[PDB]
């Protein structure tokens, strides 16, 4: 008897088992959903980190970039869960800023391409997603996306704090076409977490400034959230995407709930 | 359930159509244990829920209740036992601050009264009540998005912007407590009041402005608006009272639609 | 040859020479303002500070909580200025808390006596202000209260940030009825000035703890500004007042312009 | 004895008299301020236009999506404003999105390559002109740039508003450098300007009302962020839609 029994979810965006969308797909099996899991590039890597998962689930290859990719989803899922299933949930756990666009380089030398590349796989992406998927989704659907709350600037997240404002944007125009399918559409804005390469610049792979920058920020996280964050805790955001993808918020939709200890409505 | 073996306190019951009795239906259906309060005919809508419930009495502008809450609902759920929950459905102002009154119009003992039983009483509660509720607990209180002026609701939007800003307070309190606080944000929902408006209750003018917030309530959410139903309203601060949203504190959940996140 | 050349305006909040309204009508006057200032409670010691202004202007009393006041407002300030001639702005500077719902008394602690008449100071007062004034206001006029952004809770200011909040939703009100008279109705929220009751705080009026939060406050202000913040300047905030009682802003209404450094923008 | 006497301002995105650029640059020019504007692809069409205003500015050509344009752009400002003098005032009012990502088209068949193009043109170029200009700017100066509130989704704008977003965001970190020369950074959020149903609810929800074929106000305003009135305000959206945004109903 889990929150989301019987319900047949895709989960985008596992890399490693630090990743948010492991814990994610973690947490949806511990509740009873039957997953379908797609990756980007390392297939082979990938499938030996889904292992790791608690339950089996297929694994389909989905390059974002990738138009034929996008074309063939909705086929290949249906495969998968067998014709005449549906999906009742997508979670989008996709994010990529070239070092160029975040980090230690400053605002201004972040050439295009590489920006451009940032905003089509973390902001347009959700859009193509939503366009593939919507035609294999059941009425009473539920579509996530992962945000870090872009409403103020700050040191280093640069041009990926741009390409959440969009990813913010695109949700809310993604809900008005889901909505036709009654299909609800929202962003998970979470705490940080570290996953591999936070872990790394903290540990100074972008040197010192950019190390101490994001302990800064981390620790005033900690400081204003009334109930405090852990960064290297993605339970309480995957429940909290866990808690979008069930029956339990059925009239939110275009919108954004905050899995980040409260920090965001805090000055100090 | 849901809510399998938790303690919660619901308050702001007084008919059967009130946003407070489907939480408490609902919260009961998903395994909660309740306590109620009212505020004086409650008792003979409360036989209505699934299970029985002890009905306690709570006037929040009564020092002498405030003062004396937590002992009766220690007496209520047992020596040794703490709440998991606490649910804040209170929302009161005068005809005078809200309607068909001028914005100009409404004294300030009116608007006062209105802001101590919508507003300050949320803090009240959560002082009263944090003392005896548990780590991981859930206090809820119910909110209209205050973001933009709109007609007739007047004083009593002035009153959701002051809640907003007591929720964002009481969370820097609850935190101590391992507590959090939040408010759901409802879109219209035609409750014994909203019903008698609609009907005529303040005249043409004033009917005839509901019923075009209303419409508009629906067609811009992506995925509509019942007016006549209070059920996904009550499944959402459920879902606040579950450990299922475990990150969120000092926030507003929006059960509306969608429809705050759309222009046209 | 100023700004507000011809202008008739009306500026409450003088109390000492360090008041934002002091620097309002400073300001007002040095860009050709003509003024009618309103004191309340201690008209004389008022009157010797509003002798430093660089020009007179007359002094009427106005008690914000006094119904008599209030209805006697209009006619006052119209024997003031003359019959025929109206109004072009009017400065809404008055705040008030007690002790007990700010500072270093725990927010549950604060009485609701205390904080009604807060509120009522701080915020029912700016829809009192311009029901007594819109009748003698021209059009293309201009209202003005004074604001501190309550969109996140912060320590120590507890129970006036409340009172703020309610303010910026009763300006939203006030712009409605304003609209009517072809008048605009504004808030300026401004970054942490060094007056009469925050300059007491810093020094230890409400102890170690109290003083302790407002410092640490106003060093993370200058510090995310980008371009600083000068706690003990009002100029910048004065000049923002008076940009909203010029010609130069004239579809604003109902709105909140910040004069906080760009605080408010910047994480970190 | 203007709003705006001895400034130096650089205004871009002039294509034809009712562009918002064109009414910035007369109510500029009436203030006493001096002007550079730059044109986009149209030069010889722009230049006629420009005439048009009350006073003689040098026009520059500005491709935004043009490296070679932008490399150079200081050192052509710098040329037609004299050597020692640098600018107080730069306004950007530059915007685009292929009609595949916006109006009727439905909002998943715009193609990335269009939407990319349009996020250039209409955010990433706000970094671009701060970028190239911050250089040659006094302290006290100010970036102002054009805005279409984005919070809320809203039929036909689609791509448009997704690139406002973009926009919003790359203001609060281009103040973030601008800070470092004393200068501010700020957008105007204006209401729709004829350069229906959606811009017949604006002057119906607007306490003032709303003017969209009256572009004046709106350049008034964009004047107010230029001046020295407005000098604790950087990162921020000021909005010149008659209070629209403030009502719901
Ligand atoms: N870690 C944090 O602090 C934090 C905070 C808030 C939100 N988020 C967001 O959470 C999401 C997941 O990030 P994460 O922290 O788990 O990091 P991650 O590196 O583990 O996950 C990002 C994923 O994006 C995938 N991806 C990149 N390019 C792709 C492409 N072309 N096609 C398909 N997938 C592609 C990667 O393969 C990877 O699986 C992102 O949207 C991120 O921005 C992270
Ligand atoms: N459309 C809507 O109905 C709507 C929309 C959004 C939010 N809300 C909010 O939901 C909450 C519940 O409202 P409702 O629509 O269910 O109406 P309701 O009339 O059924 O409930 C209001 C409750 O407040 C109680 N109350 C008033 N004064 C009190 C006092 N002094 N002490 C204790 N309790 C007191 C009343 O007894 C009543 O039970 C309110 O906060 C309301 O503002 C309602
Ligand atoms: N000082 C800051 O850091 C700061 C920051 C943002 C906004 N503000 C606001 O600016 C305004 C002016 O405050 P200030 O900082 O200049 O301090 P202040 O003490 O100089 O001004 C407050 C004024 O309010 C008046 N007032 C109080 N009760 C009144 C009543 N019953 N009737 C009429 N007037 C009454 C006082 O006499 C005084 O002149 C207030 O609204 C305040 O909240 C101040
Ligand atoms: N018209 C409205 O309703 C409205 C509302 C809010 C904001 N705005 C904004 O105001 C600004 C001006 O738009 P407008 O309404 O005056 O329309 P417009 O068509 O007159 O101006 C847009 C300008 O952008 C220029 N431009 C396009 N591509 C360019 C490039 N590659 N390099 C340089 N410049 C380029 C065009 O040449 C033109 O001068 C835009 O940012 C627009 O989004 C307009
Ligand atoms: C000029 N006024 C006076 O001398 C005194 C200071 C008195 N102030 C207060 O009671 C209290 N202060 C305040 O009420 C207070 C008012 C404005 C600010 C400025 N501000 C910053 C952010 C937002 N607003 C700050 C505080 C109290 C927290 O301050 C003490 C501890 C310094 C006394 C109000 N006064 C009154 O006389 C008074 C009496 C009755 C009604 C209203 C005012
Ligand atoms: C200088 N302008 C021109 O003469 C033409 C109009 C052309 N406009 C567009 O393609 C499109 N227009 C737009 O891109 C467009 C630009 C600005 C606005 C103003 N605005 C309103 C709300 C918010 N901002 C509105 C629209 C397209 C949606 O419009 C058609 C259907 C009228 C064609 C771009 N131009 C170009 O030549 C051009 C070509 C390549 C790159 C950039 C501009
Ligand atoms: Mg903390
Ligand atoms: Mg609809
Ligand atoms: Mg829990």
Same mark, same amino acid.
């Given at each position: 008897?889990?929150?989301?029994?019987?319900?047949?979810?895709?989960?985008?965006?596992?890399?490693?088992? /630090?990743?948010?969308?492991?814990?994610?797909?973690?947490?949806?099996?511990?509740?009873?959903?039957?997953?379908?899991?797609?990756?980007?590039?390392?297939?082979?890597?990938?499938?030996? @980190?889904?292992?790791?998962?608690?339950? #089996? &689930?297929?694994?389909?290859?989905? +390059?974002?970039?990738?138009?034929?990719?996008?074309?063939?989803?909705?086929?290949?899922?249906?495969?998968?869960?067998?014709?005449? !299933?549906?999906? +009742?949930?997508?979670?989008?756990?996709?994010?990529?800023?070239?070092?160029?666009?975040?980090?230690?380089?400053?605002?201004?030398?972040? $050439?295009?391409?590489?920006?451009? #590349?940032?905003?089509?796989?973390?902001?347009?992406?959700? &859009?193509?997603?939503?366009?593939?998927?919507?035609?294999?989704?059941?009425?009473?659907? /539920?579509?996530?996306?992962?945000?870090?709350?872009?409403?103020?600037?700050?040191? =280093?997240?640069?041009?990926?704090?741009?390409?959440?404002?969009?990813?913010?944007?695109? !949700?809310?125009?993604?809900?008005?076409?889901?909505? #036709?399918?009654?299909?609800?559409? !929202?962003?998970? &804005?979470?705490?940080?977490?570290?996953?591999?390469?936070?872990?790394?610049?903290?540990?100074?792979?972008?040197?010192?400034?950019?190390? =101490?920058?994001?302990?800064?920020?981390?620790?005033?996280? +900690?400081?204003?959230?009334? @109930?405090?964050?852990?960064? #290297?805790? =993605?339970?309480?955001?995957?429940?909290?995407?866990?808690?979008?993808?069930?029956?339990?918020? $059925?009239?939110?939709?275009? +919108?954004?709930?905050?899995?980040?200890?409260?920090?965001?409505?805090?000055?100090?």
């Amino acid at each position: 008897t889990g929150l989301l029994d019987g319900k047949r979810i895709l989960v985008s965006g596992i890399i490693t088992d /630090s990743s948010i969308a492991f814990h994610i797909a973690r947490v949806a099996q511990e509740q009873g959903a039957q997953l379908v899991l797609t990756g980007f590039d390392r297939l082979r890597l990938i499938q030996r @980190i889904t292992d790791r998962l608690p339950a #089996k &689930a297929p694994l389909l290859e989905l +390059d974002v970039q990738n138009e034929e990719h996008l074309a063939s989803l909705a086929g290949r899922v249906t495969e998968a869960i067998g014709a005449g !299933n549906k999906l +009742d949930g997508v979670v989008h756990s996709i994010g990529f800023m070239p070092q160029t666009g975040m980090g230690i380089n400053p605002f201004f030398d972040a $050439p295009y391409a590489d920006v451009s #590349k940032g905003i089509h796989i973390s902001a347009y992406s959700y &859009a193509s997603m939503a366009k593939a998927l919507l035609p294999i989704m059941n009425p009473g659907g /539920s579509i996530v996306g992962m945000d870090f709350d872009p409403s103020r600037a700050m040191p =280093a997240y640069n041009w990926m704090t741009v390409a959440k404002s969009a990813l913010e944007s695109v !949700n809310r125009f993604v809900a008005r076409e889901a909505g #036709k399918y009654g299909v609800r559409s !929202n962003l998970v &804005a979470a705490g940080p977490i570290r996953t591999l390469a936070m872990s790394a610049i903290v540990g100074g792979a972008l040197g010192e400034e950019a190390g =101490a920058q994001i302990q800064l920020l981390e620790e005033g996280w +900690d400081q204003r959230a009334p @109930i405090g964050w852990n960064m #290297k805790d =993605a339970t309480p955001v995957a429940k909290t995407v866990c808690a979008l993808l069930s029956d339990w918020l $059925p009239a939110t939709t275009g +919108d954004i709930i905050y899995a980040d200890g409260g920090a965001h409505t805090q000055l100090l």
